[PDB]
Write an enzyme that holds these catalytic residues in place. Sequence first.
Site, short mmCIF file in Angstrom:
data_model
loop_
_atom_site.label_atom_id
_atom_site.label_comp_id
_atom_site.label_asym_id
_atom_site.label_seq_id
_atom_site.Cartn_x
_atom_site.Cartn_y
_atom_site.Cartn_z
CD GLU A 201 -3.00 -0.85 0.13
OE1 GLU A 201 -3.04 0.16 -0.66
OE2 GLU A 201 -3.83 -1.88 -0.27
CG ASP B 149 -7.97 3.54 -4.72
OD1 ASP B 149 -8.30 4.06 -5.81
OD2 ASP B 149 -8.64 3.09 -3.92
#
Length: 164
Positions: free
Chosen positions: A11, A20
């Site tokens: 991440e 994202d």
Amino acid sequence: MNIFEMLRIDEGLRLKIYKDTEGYYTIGIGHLLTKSPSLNAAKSELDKAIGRNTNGVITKDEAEKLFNQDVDAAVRGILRNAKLKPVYDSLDAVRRAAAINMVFQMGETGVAGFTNSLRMLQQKRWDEAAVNLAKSRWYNQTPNRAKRVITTFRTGTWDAYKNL
Ligand SMILES: Fc1c(Cl)c(F)c(Cl)c(F)c1Cl
């Protein structure tokens, strides 16, 4: 290696609001804020999550606090889901981490279609399960990450992360 270190690799860490892989506003260590295209809506979600008026930037301590909560929430969610708990219980701790990783990324709704993969994993047919997992939107959209998670399910080792 462990679930925290694993997701930290997958991440990253960013202290200002960013989008994202799906184009959704996010912060810290993959903390999804909202699917709304409104930055103001995202900022509101951030303030609510942190408990202060932030205007889009948080500290590392704050990012790690949200991260711990998110990992906890993913595990607790698996354990409350009738379609996921049996497979999770059947796994060793390394493969359990791979399961948490998937739920962290796509949620319980994002994984609803993985029924056949789940069966193969509970059967411990690791090569067949690995083949089936790759036949997914998940693999196609995030192949490098999916490959790491799949390798973890296939081998029950941390080999896909030990170099990273
Ligand atoms: F145990 C699991 C769980 Cl809970 C899950 F959500 C996925 Cl996607 C998975 F592959 C396994 Cl093995």
